[PDB]
């Protein structure tokens, strides 16, 4: 799959693209995403996580278990959008509206991914 | 009229099938197809990124691809079109699980290793231990080692493609076995087939191995026997704890994985220099009896067609395309016997003209029936691409027509006499008309055997007789050249289909790939290319578990 | 259910004949020829 | 949300790029109220099936100890015919570590006439509940035909004194558990624990 | 007090990490199953599928017969189009069918030549530079031995060997080779010409890394039991960028073993769990290199790198000497004897060194071959035992074996392989035989050991399995961080 992180942080860049390469690797879902974008927020506590998967709800639950997996375990408020490209955005504190903005914004970005 | 290949006709082409004009060069070339754009947005990523701008595909070198309109592809009796690069087989995972299927399977008989046991090694063998070594070989085939956990094992998720089955022709034993195991007769065969084939096999058992894909792709086909037998081995010593000498345990161990082998193919001499279970050594028979319609259809057309199916997708596409040739492949012939319903059309006009004129099995194999059904076929398949100009655009390649017409002839004559070798002399004079008619046959090599069939058909002599069921693609005259050998079988099928045959050449092939468990589903090969050609074929072999995920 | 009758276990279909029952800490249970308690909830009668 | 302290085991791993966990070892979780019982420290059972349930159980808010079987591996001496290939046993002292916890949740393989045996000798010894995590199908009464006992299928003459409380089937050695059989065992846990 | 249901602890020493010899990685033992490890896999892949072309002849019949000039421009528009053809792309024969990019993103045809004029306007893109990749006094060497000749290096797809067998490659070569001439001249799509390309194309200049097994053997070509121990040497890239002897033959000595051993005798020629722990007791600890340098030390101290001419007596007393100083360390140290618990283990480990050692004082292979059976002979009686039973059949028989000159019993060690009769069944011996092979010459500084064709093939440097360092590579195919071509995933569904 293709990952990448967008964060202004240079150690967690690289730590946590190792971390979402290993829960792809340990569900066995490399071959089944085509994408997998992470942007990391954490002056204001919040991470979004971005799948676009090749072309069930098996394949569903994998995907929410990856989500738990790579998500830092302080952030349990988490809410997801599935439209073919499924985000999620996990905070501690209550969802804001531009987060979900950019939940969007990253869902389109991850459509037109070619 | 009314023909089978019309609708496929209306759907591929947009003019009338009946109209003999139409316009090129206003298509936009490959982008028309979005196979070849979907290929050119690939390269361009593989390129940039792991070539480090080595160019791989320039579809600007070469000859204009698209000149004229890329038709699309219809598969006979299956409502789904798919383009034509999508039943190329390496771009098919159907086609290569079709192969790797037949190249994985052993089939060992369990009657002297039980004889051996009793008497000589004095151990008693009972439907218990009879599961308890089922339950061994289950475990221990694919990678595993029966308590030891100080050996290195094969990861299970790399081999869940990977069966140990059994079956017998002895009820009593059949129901005493476990099920979650056993491929059983009764129930997988209609009544009068189940006792056919149950006489034919006798009261004996025979165990079924199928080793995992994998072991076949990284391998070669020779490798499969000796990893079955290796694996009987070790499971029966395990299973089964015996005092006797080591003497007595190589006794034991002839009887078990060394006497009563049953393996796919043979292993092929001088220039073809291969091992066993590889495509060129499986006999027409074994294909006929590896394909399973007689078991859920009654009609012998759809019987022979499918075996038609079969044999083209590994004969001329895998085995000739790739094993002997290699590069883009021999797809254009091998799609042309099973895409469109123009091969079933012909043969079904064949059946009727047969059953109107001599009757379903009515004659006796003499010349003039052959001569007479084979002509009539001929022609009248002749005359259908001649009235349809869009027919004869589909199969614009000469080979590809007289592959189609020639087995038609071939299923005719077979049904007709019931003589596979009277089908082959049907479909050679077929050949020679069709040359005479059209002033054209195949390419520059194809009609090699079609020149010396007619001679090799009912001959005597040591190099050119043998039963059709006994011939294969290592038969002198069939060695090369693509265009035959699928359909070959396909007469050998219907030799039988025309007397309703259980088997063809071996029952015990046909029981064992009755199995289940199998990936690729030998009922019906054609639905299961059409589901690979679509992406949507789950094959077996793939290291995802062994290989990062970036 | 009673003493005599056939009954086959639902999750593997082993076929035996009730020889007694012999409830036990207020629990019904079903004794079968190969001397193995069953529970009536997974058993069921066949003729 | 409780604060949740384990003893670590009083003696390192298996060399330097190996496992963290040794052979015949017991990492008491303070407040006893699950064992996992490890058949071996290697990776077709360590951190790949039994770490996970572990975090698990640790993160349904239950207390875990881990201990790992001097001899995990093989079948019992009892098993007909005697055992082959190696040994299956268990130790007083690690009968003791583990039936002071509230429940066990033990890992086994494929094989079902090693596992049917195997947790008849486990059961002999252990009076607690237990849960029986394996890869193969295997049914709550193939352990009363050979005398273990067990919550649905009773065996007339019992032979162990643990119950065999749950099975679950479709964990598969050295490979990462999925979040659904998490989740099963989690539920059973917490279902026949409290 | 005796109680019979406490067991016995078993395998202690199995559940311990197996360092790799040369490195720093610690990996399991079962991640060194051929079958598990996507590194041998791709080893074997990238050996398979490797055809090399002599591009000489055809461009003799383009001048003489079609009456074509050929330049170094239609060079590189041959280049370009095979690049496009070979994978399985279209130039002729409008309306065919394509394979999708994304299987065939490792097919490269690659071109070299020892004419450095022609060399120099060629685009460096296809392009395998001699003068870049090896050293000088190397590249003279080799330059030298392959002549003012070109050829073409062809790697076809890993898929295509996975799906058929080893000697697909072959045609598969031929068949895109003459299309791409027959488009790229502007040629008639078929006349004389075109068979004289495809006869040239198709056995003439063609070099295959293995010959063809037919009989009782019964197996074709590019199969791991045609490749001789010479062109496994020459396979192994570290010659060319390390200077010590001894890692360049123990190099060679891991790829043996994991080709060999592993791939070949536990797989084309057994099955199951095959020969895992027997081959990576040549690659895992430092037990091989240690006993090697210290023949190497020994050699040079009492010799020198190649100061004595192979006899019977320098064999003997080389051979005896680390056939008793590596008993020697097996006794001394325990945790050695736990590690090779296996005689076959020991006795294949003894015996390589002495070879190795042997090799290094003398230059001569057959003389490395005599020292190993030497070797095991004298491990015989050192111990009371060699290893399993039908392991010592090549060794009883080798002594008489290693200077025969009779028809089926000689050939010297670079033409030996695994068709050999005497190596044609048992494991534990051949790996060992390339690496003595190999040490022969790592003696004699030479820039290859039986062909400039294939070691010069091998160091392109996009081939997916880096023949450098093998161990390096098996050790990140057991970490799960290599990766390896020959996978369908655009063609399958999502799972
Ligand atoms: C160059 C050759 C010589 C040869 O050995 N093979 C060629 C070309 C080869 C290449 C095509 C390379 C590419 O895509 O550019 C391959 C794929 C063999 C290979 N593995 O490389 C092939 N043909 Ni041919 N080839 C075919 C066919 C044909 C039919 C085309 C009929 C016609 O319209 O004239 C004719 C034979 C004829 O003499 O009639 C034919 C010829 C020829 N075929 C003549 C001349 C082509 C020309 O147009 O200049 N192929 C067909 O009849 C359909 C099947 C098709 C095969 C691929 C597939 O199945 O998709 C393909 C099979
Ligand atoms: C367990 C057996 C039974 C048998 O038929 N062969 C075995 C087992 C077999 C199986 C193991 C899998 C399994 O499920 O059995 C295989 C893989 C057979 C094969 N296909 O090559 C094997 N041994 Ni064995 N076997 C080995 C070895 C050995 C060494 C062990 C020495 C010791 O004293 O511990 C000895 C041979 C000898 O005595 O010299 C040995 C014996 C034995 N080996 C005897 C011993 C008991 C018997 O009397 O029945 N192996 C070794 O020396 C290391 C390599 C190892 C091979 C697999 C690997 O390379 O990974 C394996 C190779
Ligand atoms: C193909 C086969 O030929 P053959 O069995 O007909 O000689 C040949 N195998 C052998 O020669 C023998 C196979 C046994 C495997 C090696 C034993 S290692 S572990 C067993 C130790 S022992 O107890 O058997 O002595 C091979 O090339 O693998
Ligand atoms: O036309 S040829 O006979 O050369 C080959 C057809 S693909």
């Known amino acids: 799959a293709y990952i990448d992180v967008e964060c202004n942080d240079e150690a967690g860049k690289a730590i946590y693209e190792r971390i979402i390469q290993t829960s792809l690797e340990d569900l066995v879902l490399g071959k089944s995403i085509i994408k997998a974008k992470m942007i990391c927020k954490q002056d204001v506590p919040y991470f979004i996580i971005g799948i676009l998967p090749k072309s069930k709800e098996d394949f569903i639950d994998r995907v929410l278990d990856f989500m738990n997996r790579v998500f830092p375990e302080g952030m349990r408020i988490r809410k997801t959008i599935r439209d073919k490209t499924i985000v999620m955005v996990a905070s501690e504190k209550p969802i804001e509206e531009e987060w979900m903005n950019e939940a969007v914004k990253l869902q389109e970005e991850l459509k037109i991914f070619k | 009229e009314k023909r089978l290949f019309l609708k496929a006709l209306k759907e591929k082409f947009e003019e009338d099938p009946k109209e003999k004009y139409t316009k090129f060069y206003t298509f936009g070339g490959w982008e028309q197809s979005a196979r070849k754009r979907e290929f050119v947005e690939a390269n361009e990523k593989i390129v940039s990124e792991k070539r480090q701008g080595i160019p791989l595909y320039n579809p600007d070198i070469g000859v204009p691809l698209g000149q004229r309109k890329l038709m699309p592809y219809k598969l006979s009796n299956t409502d789904d079109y798919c383009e034509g690069d999508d039943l190329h087989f390496l771009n098919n995972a159907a086609i290569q699980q079709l192969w790797d299927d037949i190249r994985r399977t052993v089939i060992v008989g369990m009657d002297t290793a039980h004889s051996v046991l009793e008497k000589r090694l004095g151990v008693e063998v009972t439907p218990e231990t009879i599961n308890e070594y089922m339950h061994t070989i289950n475990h221990s085939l694919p990678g595993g080692a029966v308590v030891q956990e100080h050996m290195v094992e094969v990861h299970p998720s790399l081999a869940w493609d990977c069966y140990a089955r059994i079956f017998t022709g002895d009820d009593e034993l059949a129901d005493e076995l476990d099920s979650r195991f056993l491929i059983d007769i009764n129930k997988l065969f209609p009544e009068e087939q189940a006792e056919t084939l149950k006489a034919a096999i006798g009261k004996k058992t025979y165990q079924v191995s199928r080793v995992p894909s994998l072991v076949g792709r990284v391998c070669d086909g020779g490798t499969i026997s000796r990893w079955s037998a290796m694996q009987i081995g070790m499971s029966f010593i395990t299973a089964y704890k015996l005092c006797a000498g080591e003497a007595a345990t190589a006794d034991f161990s002839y009887a078990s994985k060394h006497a009563d082998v049953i393996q796919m193919g043979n292993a092929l001499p001088g220039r073809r220099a291969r091992g066993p279970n590889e495509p060129g050594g499986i006999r027409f028979g074994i294909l006929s009896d590896v394909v399973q319609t007689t078991r859920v259809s009654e009609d012998p057309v759809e019987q022979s067609l499918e075996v038609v199916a079969t044999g083209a997708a590994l004969y001329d596409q895998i085995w000739l395309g790739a094993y002997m040739s290699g590069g883009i492949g021999f797809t254009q012939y091998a799609t042309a016997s099973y895409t469109d319903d123009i091969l079933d059309d012909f043969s079904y006009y064949a059946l009727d003209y047969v059953e109107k004129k001599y009757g379903r099995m009515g004659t006796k194999a003499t010349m003039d029936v052959v001569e007479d059904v084979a002509g009539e076929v001929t022609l009248y398949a002749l005359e259908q691409y001649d009235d349809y100009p869009a027919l004869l655009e589909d199969h614009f390649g000469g080979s590809q027509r007289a592959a189609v017409a020639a087995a038609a002839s071939g299923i005719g004559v077979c049904m007709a006499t019931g003589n596979s070798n009277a089908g082959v002399n049907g479909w050679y004079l077929s050949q020679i008309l069709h040359k005479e008619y059209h002033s054209r046959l195949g390419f520059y090599g194809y009609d090699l055997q079609d020149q010396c069939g007619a001679s090799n058909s009912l001959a005597i002599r040591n190099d050119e007789a043998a039963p059709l069921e006994l011939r294969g693609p290592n038969y002198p005259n069939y060695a090369m050249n693509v265009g035959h050998q699928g359909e070959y079988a396909g007469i050998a099928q219907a030799a039988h289909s025309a007397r309703g045959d259980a088997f063809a050449l071996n029952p015990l092939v046909k029981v064992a790939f009755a199995d289940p468990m199998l990936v690729f589903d030998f009922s019906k090969p054609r639905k299961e290319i059409a589901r690979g050609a679509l992406r949507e074929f789950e094959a077996a072999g793939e290291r995802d578990v062994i290989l990062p995920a970036k | 259910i009673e003493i005599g009758s056939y009954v086959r276990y639902i999750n593997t279909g082993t076929h035996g004949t009730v020889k007694a029952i012999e409830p036990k800490n207020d629990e019904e249970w079903v004794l079968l020829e190969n001397d193995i308690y069953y529970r009536p909830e997974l058993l069921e009668l066949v003729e | ?194």
């Open chain 4, 1 to 194: 949300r409780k604060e949740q302290i384990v003893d670590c085991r009083a003696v390192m791993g298996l060399g330097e790029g190996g496992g963290l966990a040794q052979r015949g070892t017991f990492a008491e979780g303070l407040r006893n109220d699950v064992v996992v019982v490890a058949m071996s420290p290697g990776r077709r059972h360590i951190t790949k099936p039994v770490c996970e349930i572990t975090y698990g159980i640790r993160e349904a808010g239950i207390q875990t100890s881990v201990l790992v079987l001097d001899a995990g591996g093989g079948i019992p001496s009892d098993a007909p015919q005697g055992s082959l290939g190696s040994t299956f046993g268990l130790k007083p002292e690690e009968a003791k570590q583990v039936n002071r916890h509230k429940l066990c949740v033990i890992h086994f393989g494929n094989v079902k006439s090693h596992i049917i045996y195997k947790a008849r000798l486990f059961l002999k010894y252990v009076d607690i509940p237990t849960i029986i995590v394996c890869q193969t199908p295997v049914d709550m009464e193939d352990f009363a035909a050979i005398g273990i006992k067990t919550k649905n299928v009773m065996p007339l003459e019992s032979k162990t004194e643990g119950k065999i409380v749950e099975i679950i089937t479709g964990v598969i050695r050295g490979e990462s558990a999925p979040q659904k059989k998490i989740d099963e065992i989690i539920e059973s846990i917490k279902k026949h624990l409290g």
